Amino acid sequence: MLQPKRTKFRKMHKGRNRGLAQGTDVSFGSFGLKAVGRGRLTARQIEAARRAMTRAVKRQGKIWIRVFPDKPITEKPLAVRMGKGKGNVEYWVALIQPGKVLYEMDGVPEELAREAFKLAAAKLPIKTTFVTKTVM
Amino acid sequence: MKFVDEASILVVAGDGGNGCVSFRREKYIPKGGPDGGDGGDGGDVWMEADENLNTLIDYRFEKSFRAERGQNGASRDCTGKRGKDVTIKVPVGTRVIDQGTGETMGDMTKHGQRLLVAKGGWHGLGNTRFKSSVNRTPRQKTNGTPGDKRELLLELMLLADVGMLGMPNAGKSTFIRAVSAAKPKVADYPFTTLVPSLGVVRMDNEKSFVVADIPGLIEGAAEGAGLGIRFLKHLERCRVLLHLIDIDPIDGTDPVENARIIISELEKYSQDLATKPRWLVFNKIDLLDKVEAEEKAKAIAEALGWEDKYYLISAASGLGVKDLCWDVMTFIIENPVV
Amino acid sequence: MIQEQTMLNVADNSGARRVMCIKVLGGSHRRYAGVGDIIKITIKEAIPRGKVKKGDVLKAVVVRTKKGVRRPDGSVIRFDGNACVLLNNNSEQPIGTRIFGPVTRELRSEKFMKIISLAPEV
RNA sequence: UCGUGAAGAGGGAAACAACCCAGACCGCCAGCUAAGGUCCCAAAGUCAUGGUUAAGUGGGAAACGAUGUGGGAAGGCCCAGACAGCCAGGAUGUUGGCUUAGAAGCAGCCAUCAUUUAAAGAAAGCGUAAUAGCUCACUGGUCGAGUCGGCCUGCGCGGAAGA
RNA sequence: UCCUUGUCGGGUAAGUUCCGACCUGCACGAAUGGCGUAAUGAUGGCCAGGCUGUCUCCACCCGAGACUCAGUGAAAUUGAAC
RNA sequence: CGGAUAAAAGGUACUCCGGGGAUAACAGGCUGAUACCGCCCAAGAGUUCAUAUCGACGGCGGUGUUUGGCACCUCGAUGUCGGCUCAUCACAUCCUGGGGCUGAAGUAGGUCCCAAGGGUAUGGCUGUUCGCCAUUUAAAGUGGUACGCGAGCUGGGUUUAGAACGUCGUGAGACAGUUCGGUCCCUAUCUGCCGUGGGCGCUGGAGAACUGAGGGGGGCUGCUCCUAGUACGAGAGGACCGG
Numbered sequence A: 001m002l003q004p005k006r007t008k009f010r011k012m013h014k015g016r017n018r019g020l021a022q023g024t025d026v027s028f029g030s031f032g033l034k035a036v037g038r039g040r041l042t043a044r045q046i047e048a049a050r051r052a053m054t055r056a057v058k059r060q061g062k063i064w065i066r067v068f069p070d071k072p073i074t075e076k077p078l079a080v081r082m083g084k085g086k087g088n089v090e091y092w093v094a095l096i097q098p099g100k101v102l103y104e105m106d107g108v109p110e111e112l113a114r115e116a117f118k119l120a121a122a123k124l125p126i127k128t129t130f131v132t133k134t135v136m
Numbered sequence B: 001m002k003f004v005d006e007a008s009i010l011v012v013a014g015d016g017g018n019g020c021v022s023f024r025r026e027k028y029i030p031k032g033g034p035d036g037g038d039g040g041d042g043g044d045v046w047m048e049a050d051e052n053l054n055t056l057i058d059y060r061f062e063k064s065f066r067a068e069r070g071q072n073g074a075s076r077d078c079t080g081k082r083g084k085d086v087t088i089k090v091p092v093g094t095r096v097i098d099q100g101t102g103e104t105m106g107d108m109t110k111h112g113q114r115l116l117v118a119k120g121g122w123h124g125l126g127n128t129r130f131k132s133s134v135n136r137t138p139r140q141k142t143n144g145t146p147g148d149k150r151e152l153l154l155e156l157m158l159l160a161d162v163g164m165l166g167m168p169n170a171g172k173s174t175f176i177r178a179v180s181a182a183k184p185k186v187a188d189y190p191f192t193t194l195v196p197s198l199g200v201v202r203m204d205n206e207k208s209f210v211v212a213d214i215p216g217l218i219e220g221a222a223e224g225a226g227l228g229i230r231f232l233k234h235l236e237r238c239r240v241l242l243h244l245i246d247i248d249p250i251d252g253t254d255p256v257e258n259a260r261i262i263i264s265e266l267e268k269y270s271q272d273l274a275t276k277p278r279w280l281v282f283n284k285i286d287l288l289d290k291v292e293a294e295e296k297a298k299a300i301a302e303a304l305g306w307e308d309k310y311y312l313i314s315a316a317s318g319l320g321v322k323d324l325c326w327d328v329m330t331f332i333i334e335n336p337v338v
Numbered sequence C: 001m002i003q004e005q006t007m008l009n010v011a012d013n014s015g016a017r018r019v020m021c022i023k024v025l026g027g028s029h030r031r032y033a034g035v036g037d038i039i040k041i042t043i044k045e046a047i048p049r050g051k052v053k054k055g056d057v058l059k060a061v062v063v064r065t066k067k068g069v070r071r072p073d074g075s076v077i078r079f080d081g082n083a084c085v086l087l088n089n090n091s092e093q094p095i096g097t098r099i100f101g102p103v104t105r106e107l108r109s110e111k112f113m114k115i116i117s118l119a120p121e122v
Numbered sequence D: 001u002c003g004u005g006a007a008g009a010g011g012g013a014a015a016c017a018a019c020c021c022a023g024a025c026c027g028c029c030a031g032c033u034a035a036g037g038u039c040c041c042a043a044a045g046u047c048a049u050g051g052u053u054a055a056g057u058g059g060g061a062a063a064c065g066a067u068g069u070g071g072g073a074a075g076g077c078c079c080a081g082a083c084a085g086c087c088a089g090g091a092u093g094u095u096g097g098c099u100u101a102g103a104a105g106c107a108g109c110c111a112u113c114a115u116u117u118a119a120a121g122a123a124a125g126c127g128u129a130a131u132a133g134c135u136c137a138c139u140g141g142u143c144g145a146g147u148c149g150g151c152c153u154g155c156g157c158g159g160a161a162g163a
Numbered sequence E: 001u002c003c004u005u006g007u008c009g010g011g012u013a014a015g016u017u018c019c020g021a022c023c024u025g026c027a028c029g030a031a032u033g034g035c036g037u038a039a040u041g042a043u044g045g046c047c048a049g050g051c052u053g054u055c056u057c058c059a060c061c062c063g064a065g066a067c068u069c070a071g072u073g074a075a076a077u078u079g080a081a082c
Numbered sequence F: 001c002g003g004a005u006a007a008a009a010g011g012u013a014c015u016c017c018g019g020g021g022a023u024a025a026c027a028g029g030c031u032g033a034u035a036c037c038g039c040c041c042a043a044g045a046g047u048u049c050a051u052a053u054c055g056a057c058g059g060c061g062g063u064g065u066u067u068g069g070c071a072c073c074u075c076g077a078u079g080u081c082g083g084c085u086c087a088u089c090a091c092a093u094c095c096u097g098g099g100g101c102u103g104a105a106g107u108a109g110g111u112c113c114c115a116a117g118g119g120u121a122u123g124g125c126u127g128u129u130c131g132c133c134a135u136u137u138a139a140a141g142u143g144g145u146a147c148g149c150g151a152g153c154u155g156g157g158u159u160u161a162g163a164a165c166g167u168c169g170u171g172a173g174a175c176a177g178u179u180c181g182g183u184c185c186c187u188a189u190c191u192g193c194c195g196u197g198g199g200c201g202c203u204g205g206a207g208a209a210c211u212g213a214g215g216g217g218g219g220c221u222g223c224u225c226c227u228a229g230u231a232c233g234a235g236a237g238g239a240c241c242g243g
Ligand SMILES: Nc1nc2c(ncn2[C@@H]2O[C@H](COP(=O)(O)OP(=O)(O)O)[C@@H](O)[C@H]2O)c(=O)[nH]1
Pocket: B166, B167, B168, B169, B170, B171, B172, B173, B174, B175, B185, B186, B187, B188, B189, B190, B191, B192, B193, B215, B216, B283, B284, B285, B286, B287, B313, B314, B315, B316, B317
């Protein structure tokens, strides 16, 4: 699974998912997958989506990753009232805003790209879309 | 009921019902005894024979059998019910083999025998069973024992009291077109019958025997010649062995060496079939004259080193089929299984 | 009129002398047993040299009833001491070679005429 | 931080103080209006125009699936005859070589051969072991005017079982 | 201290209670007394024999209430009630 | 650390008083962290063949009956666990009923769909819920009913006050621990339900017979025989339907 080895702080505020996109256009390959819905991606979902599409694309080409967890969350143990400090360490997640690219692809024809991204789109808990790199 | 297949299955026994931890809390008092009970014993697997089933067709369909997992412990000192024992219907005469220096578990010879294959896990303990004065608050529970897992190689092998092996297209299926009630497909081409369609002969009351069908094969250690060891496996509980040799084949070579090599390959199967008493009988005698096929019949006997009666049998014509049955039936009765 | 946990006598030379039926059969909520019935029994007293042993559980058939039977002509056949005959559990063939005491004719309709063949009295 | 109730009545939200309009000096048997409605219960449009809905959707719900349907930008073929039908063709050197007992389009490998008349492949499916037969893509004749499936979107259907 | 109520035997067809025992058991414990103890006990628990409406399954009957009439004549509670 | 004495530690289940749902526990409505149920994505295992049958890494939903937390309270009182009597409702159906698929030859089977009309056990153990065992049938169904029912019963568990055991403290005592015994009141006003009556109405009054707007009650089936040892089936075995 995916997680940074060293973190500046053991826990971070919950935060908000408000705002617009930054990586609207792909700048590394020819094809990419862009998120249309709003939600969160965990380490398992990123690992599952990458594994699912990997079996569909041959080593020929190139694969890019545009999503990192970057956000810690904790969970409260059982039989504990409100208080007693913050929650314990269970797993982390990532913040996703609709409009930025999630995965980037290059090196194999579009038909394989459609099949590969379709397989990985279902395991993502959000609706995505396919885009093609344009000039500039 | 026209094909025979064999496969392997994975049986898993349910682990025991896990223990529970709880503390009763009445509507007024907030402190109560360490409520909770034991788990449920895991469901076992029983290996039961069946008359109606004669193949392992459903076992290719279902390669995994799941026993009922024992119910977990609950409040009010509740113990989960023991998992129901899954019973598997199997044709009689099956042999089961495991891995990791595995061996047979038990031979099935008669219907009604139920064999214990998988032992389910046994239930754990709740906090109540850990009642004591110094502890006075048992938070400990015992996990249920894991179930027993194994992989079974289901080998189906017929209850052929009378087993017969003969030359290709020598009339083995035609021999069943005799008083035997079975109706195997009969045609002139070699290896006409591939599915073993065993039959039964009832000469009189209180006396009957079953006869199985195994097609002939060419000399091959491997699976060559289309047929091979996969059909020889149905043997090895045939109290009598019958050998069929053609006389004057219409297009094949006359038996002077091919009738000898078939004996030799029986030695190398696994153990020469424990050197069971083999009876040699002939066929294709109505094609030629009755008296002409007499001198040449015995000539083959000393050619192959055979010193028995060398019975002359006409399977299609129906002459002498009864004479062979009388001789074999007396031999069967005088030698009971012991 | 034999019910669950009823103490009866034994009417055959199987080896049991005092018996206690434990389960009456016939259907769900089977209340009482008549004259020709299949009833399950537990042996409480038997000769140590007999064919059976104490504590064995098996089936049995009542032959005599204290309440009696009902003849279709307003008649009853009462008895003094309810008795049974020993039968195997898997098979319905009786165990005892001889039958002691009379057996009513109503057992023919229940299809255990073999008992009627024995017991020469009635 | 703002408003409401607390300390505000009234109207709407079926009933409800915190949701909306709106702060009751008193009286009248007058009119106008805010939120909300104009089929009746209950007061007002069974108003007018252009559409969607067939589900009672309206009138509770997700991932997904589908010849439900309306709209839009395109593409292939198309009275030198469109797709699907009906009447026929389906053959050839040719039982294609090994694994092959038996496979020869239909168990295992394709270099995927091409030439004969052309409209048809050493070929996707039954029935066996092939055999022999049913078929298909394709073409010929007749019918004669739209057909083919990808994209975006509105409203729908299943997913949706409790005393 | 636990696992397979610990599991074998009696008791039962079936016994989380009872009885001497296997062990992987030793804390208590020897006048805050230890072991055995005949008899004794409206003392705790278990079993057996006779016995029965305790029960399957209740039915009938005998009396006192319950019911009507005549006489005397309370009660707790009650914001108001169509 | 805006600093009650210069000078002070605990328990009270032997407690009492005045207040509080200003503050816990069980239940009720938020909830799904964990776990149960359904569906989708489908690499792989599957004799050819993905969804005939599983299915790894994930996602979306539903009661939610375990393990939990949150504001709302009946503390001028909301009585439990279990058993007896009494039942009711939903179908996520235990049997009976109608089917689909089957790797369903027949019987016997397995999965799924519709269907709640009826039925759905007797005993030892323990207070038991549950469960084990013994023995039947068609099964001995799952949940709501504040995990139904004490102004119906039971007081066996839980059980204030007595006594004994193990652990901590010098001690009083606390103790989600074990053993013995240990008070369960109410004459029904109203809603409700079971039966029976008085007054009036139905348009002159009265005696009868009823039609039926509607409502309630019962709707369970085992075995054997004939078909037939027929069809099927190598044999073993053994039909559907009807009577
Ligand atoms: N005339 C004659 N023909 C026979 C006899 N036995 C067998 N056959 C023929 O042999 C043919 C093939 O026999 P088959 O069943 O193939 O024997 P298999 O080779 O062992 O499988 C059949 O079609 C029969 O007609 C016989 O006794 N006489």
